[PDB]
Amino acid sequence: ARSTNTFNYATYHTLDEIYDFMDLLVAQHPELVSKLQIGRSYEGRPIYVLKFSTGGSNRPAIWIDLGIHSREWITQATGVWFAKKFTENYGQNPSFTAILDSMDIFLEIVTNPNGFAFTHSENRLWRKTRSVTSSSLCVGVDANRNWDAGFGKAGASSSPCSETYHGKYANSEVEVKSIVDFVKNHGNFKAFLSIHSYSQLLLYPYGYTTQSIPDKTELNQVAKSAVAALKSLYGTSYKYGSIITTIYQASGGSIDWSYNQGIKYSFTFELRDTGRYGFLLPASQIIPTAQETWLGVLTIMEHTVNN
Ligand SMILES: NS(=O)(=O)N[C@@H](Cc1ccccc1)C(=O)O
Ligand SMILES: [Zn+2]
């Protein structure tokens, strides 16, 4: 509570505790991390992004977002751990140090604030945002079906009450448009990673079309390598491939959008587990999950800095 060194990484936290955590981290490592507000959620909560940088002018960057689907608590928890990990490994780990000396990292721990708060107060399994639709009593949009990539096509629902409702139009959700604007304004992102749970998968584009991306071979080899590194810690087995061939057809997904923007290294991680606990993964698995997931993300970052 007092410093990031006394913060309990082995338990799930509320929105306010995570937000306070951000201010403690920035105050402890002002020369490495800064807090940016890229917008406000539907219910007015600020949307924060942590920027890790050793300097430079608009250096190529890595984007990482967690919790777009609020009920996937393991993601926001892994995000908090990542933030701390960055500050601890810079100057200690040769590989990660090399990356931060040439690239910036943007981390969005709570991509869907309103949904997260709701999972703490009313429905632990809430998935969508909390926006209100005109002609319906149902609330929320699936933020991972709201991006401008095959928007409205098969793999999403036009029903406001559906768990996979895509919304009135692409980027209708302020939580999504805030990211879209920031990334387009930045113009120099080289990697885009969106974290989810569960089922243990590493996926690349596309989800809305059966068409194969032109960088299929390279991304597949990168995924294979990332999966091998992640498995080395506790033996956690991951499967990998394109969204549509590995899990199911899904339209309006974020990495399909990022890839079509020219960001070649676009991947989505579906963390632990495989169904035993699902979204209600025990707090005792937070650290081990984050630790192994780190090796997988580091692997992708390494390939990016050199390519
Ligand atoms: N967390 S999940 O169980 O919702 N699965 C994800 C899979 C997914 C990930 C990235 C783009 C399209 C689809 C989903 O948004 O449906
Ligand atoms: Zn999800």
166 lines ligand 1 (CB under 6 A): no
Three-point CA angle 289, 284, 144, nearest 5°:
45
Residue 190 to residues 10, 69, 303: CA-CA distances in angstroms? Answer: 31, 24, 11
Query: Near ion ligand 2, which residues have CB within 5 Å?
Result: 69, 196
Question: Which 3 state secondary structure label does DSSP give 217?
Answer: helix
272, 282 in Cβ contact below 8 A?
no
Rg (C-alpha) for the chain, rounded Å, is 18
* Structure-token pair, residue 160: 């406001």
CA of 217 to the centre of ligand 1 (A): 22
Alpha-carbon 253 to chain mean position: 12
Number of domains present in the structure of the chain: 1
CA of 144 to the centre of ligand 1 (A): 7
Q: Is 127 marked as binding a ligand?
A: yes
Q: Which domain holds residue 175?
A: 1-307
253 lines ligand 1 (CB under 6 A): yes
193, 256 in Cβ contact below 8 A?
no
Measured CA to CA, the distance from residue 156 to residue 149 in angstroms comes to 12
129, 173 in Cβ contact below 8 A?
yes
Q: Which value, to the nearest 10 degrees, does the dihedral of the CA atoms of residues 300, 303, 304, 307 take?
A: -160
Measured CA to CA, the distance from residue 98 to residue 90 in angstroms comes to 9
DSSP state of 132: B
Resolution value (Å, 1 decimal): 2.0
Tally of CB atoms within 10 A around 67:
29
- Taking the alpha carbons of 162, 240, 187, 46 in that order, is the dihedral positive or negative? positive
φ, ψ dihedrals at 85, nearest 5°? -55, -45
DSSP state of 285: G
The residue type of 258 is: S
Phi-psi domain of 272 (left: phi exceeds 0; alpha: psi -120 through 50; beta: other): beta
Measured CA to CA, the distance from residue 115 to residue 76 in angstroms comes to 12
66, 195 in Cβ contact below 8 A?
yes
**Residue 300: enclosing H or E segment and its boundaries?**
helix 286-305
Closest CA to 271 of 259, 279, 261: 279
β-strand pairing of 61-66 with 201-204: unpaired
* Sheet-wide strand order for 239-242: 33-40, 46-52, 104-108, 61-66, 189-197, 265-271, 201-204, 239-242
288, 214 in Cβ contact below 8 A?
no
114, 42 in Cβ contact below 8 A?
yes
132, 125 in Cβ contact below 8 A?
no
Point out the ligand 1 atom lying closest to the alpha carbon of residue 196: 1
Three-point CA angle 101, 102, 104, nearest 5°:
90
The residue type of 192 is: F
Contacts of 17 (CB under 8 A, 6+ apart): none
Closest CA to 90 of 105, 77, 101, 80: 101
Measured CA to CA, the distance from residue 51 to residue 34 in angstroms comes to 5
205 lines ligand 1 (CB under 6 A): no
**Which residues are marked as active site?**
270
Helix axes 15-28, 113-121, angle to 10 degrees: 130
Measured CA to CA, the distance from residue 237 to residue 305 in angstroms comes to 26
* Structure-token pair, residue 292: 């192994």
Q: Give me the CATH number covering residue 192.
A: 3.40.630.10
Point out the ligand 1 atom lying closest to the alpha carbon of residue 164: 16
**DSSP bridge pairs for 193:** 64, 267
Point out the ligand 1 atom lying closest to the alpha carbon of residue 254: 11
Measured CA to CA, the distance from residue 158 to residue 135 in angstroms comes to 13
305 lines ligand 1 (CB under 6 A): no
53, 100 in Cβ contact below 8 A?
yes
Closest CA to 194 of 50, 68, 19: 68
φ, ψ dihedrals at 219, nearest 5°? -60, -35
Measured CA to CA, the distance from residue 238 to residue 274 in angstroms comes to 10
Determine whether 166 is exposed, middle or buried from the number of CB atoms within 10 Å of its CB (0-12, 13-18, 19+): buried
168, 261 in Cβ contact below 8 A?
no
Tally of CB atoms within 10 A around 137:
8
Measured CA to CA, the distance from residue 35 to residue 52 in angstroms comes to 9
Residues composing the chain: 307
